[PDB]
Amino acid sequence: PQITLWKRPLVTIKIGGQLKEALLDTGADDTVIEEMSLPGRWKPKMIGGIGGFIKVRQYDQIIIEIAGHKAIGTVLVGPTPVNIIGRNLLTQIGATLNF
Amino acid sequence: PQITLWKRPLVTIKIGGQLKEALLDTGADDTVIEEMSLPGRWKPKMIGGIGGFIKVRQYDQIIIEIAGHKAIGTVLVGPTPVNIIGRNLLTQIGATLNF
Ligand SMILES: COc1ccc2c(c1)OCC/C=C/CCCCN(C[C@@H](O)[C@H](Cc1ccccc1)NC(=O)O[C@H]1CO[C@H]3OCC[C@H]31)S2(=O)=O
Ligand code: NA
Ligand code: NA
């Protein structure tokens, strides 16, 4: 689709067998999802955004469906106020910014 | 242009005759710039991101050029780690997300 930016660019995702709503976020390097369990190994990580840092769990090789499009990549899990699809997965659905 | 997301979508902006670098950020509702001098009146605003809230100063009706596109709108000034062009100005430059 072409998504205009009058409102937040929210889409449905499927992750870890769960449906969630998430923001398509070109300003996020990383994909960050609210607390949930994911299978497999993880390691801690700190990520910093506009209000400081949060601790997250880094899970690699996680399959996700974003607005119908399947991809695989790293997912960070932790106390983000909003679920965000960052560039690491936006590239895999072929998302571009156009103006 | 058409901007892929394999690197941060960093562009040049011009505010007050000075050039700065900023991130085109679909996950930001508003535009947030590092401390600088702007004309006119302001009002403090709290915005919530990853990490928590920060206080910013809201300046309305600011002339700002983004990647050569002229805009006139609200700029929040405060301790952001990166200059961010949010949806309030991405809509002024006719930006869309496409996949
Ligand atoms: C109202 O106007 C605004 C203005 C800005 C924001 C906002 C409302 O958020 C609203 C609430 C949503 C929060 C949910 C997620 C955060 C949303 N944000 C924009 C986002 O693009 C920031 C922009 C950014 C970029 C660099 C440093 C700091 C911030 N990126 C970010 O936090 O990314 C993290 C995940 O990947 C990693 O890569 C970059 C840092 C890290 S934001 O800055 O908090
Ligand atoms: Na894994
Ligand atoms: Na003003």
DSSP calls for chain A: -EE-SSS--EEEEEETTEEEEEEE-TT-SS-EE-S---SS--EEEEEEETTEEEEEEEEEEEEEEETTEEEEEEEEES--SS-EE-HHHHGGGT-EEE-
C-alpha neighbours within 13 Å on the C-beta side of residue A56: 28
- Residues in contact with ligand 1 by the CB-under-6-Å rule are A 25, 27-30, 32, 47, 49-50, 80-82, 84, 86; B 23, 25, 27-30, 32, 47-50, 81-82, 84, 86
Contact A84, A28 (CB under 8 A): yes
Please give the Cα distance from B38 to A83 (Å, whole number).
33
Residue A57 bridge partners (DSSP): A44, A77
Q: How far is CA B41 from CA A64, B38, B71, in A?
A: 46, 9, 19
Residues whose CB is less than 8 angstroms from the CB of residue B80 and which lie 6 or more positions away in sequence, other chains included: A50, B32, B33, B34, B54, B56
Please give the Cα distance from B19 to A65 (Å, whole number).
39
Rounded to 10 degrees, the C-alpha dihedral B45/B72/A5/B18 comes to -80
For tokens 């690699």, the residue is A60
Closest CA to A84 of A21, A40, A35, A3: A21
Q: Do B96 and A91 touch (CB under 8 A)?
A: no
Closest CA to A17 of A74, A73, A64: A64
Q: How far is CA A80 from CA A8, A47, B3, B25, in A?
A: 16, 10, 26, 17
Chain A residues in contact with B82 (beta carbon < 8 A): 27
Task: Count the Cβ atoms, other than its own, within 10 Å of residue A55.
Answer: 11
The architecture of the domain spanning B1-99 is: Beta Barrel (2.40)
Please give the Cα distance from B65 to B71 (Å, whole number).
6
Please give the Cα distance from B60 to B38 (Å, whole number).
10
- The 3-class secondary structure across chain B, one letter per residue, is CEECCCCCCEEEEEECCEEEEEEECCCCCCCEECCCCCCCCEEEEEEEECCEEEEEEEEEEEEEEECCEEEEEEEEECCCCCCEECHHHHCCCCCEEEC
Please give the Cα distance from B28 to B49 (Å, whole number).
9
Please give the Cα distance from B22 to B75 (Å, whole number).
12
Q: Do B99 and A96 touch (CB under 8 A)?
A: yes
Please give the Cα distance from B39 to B45 (Å, whole number).
17
Please give the Cα distance from B90 to B99 (Å, whole number).
17
Experimental determination technique = X-ray
* CB nearest A99 (choices: B52, B53, B95): B95
Please give the Cα distance from B60 to A89 (Å, whole number).
34
Residue A44 bridge partners (DSSP): A57
Provide the token pair at B33.
Answer: 């710039």
- Sign of the Cα torsion A69, A74, A78, A81 reads negative
Domain limits, chain B? 1-99
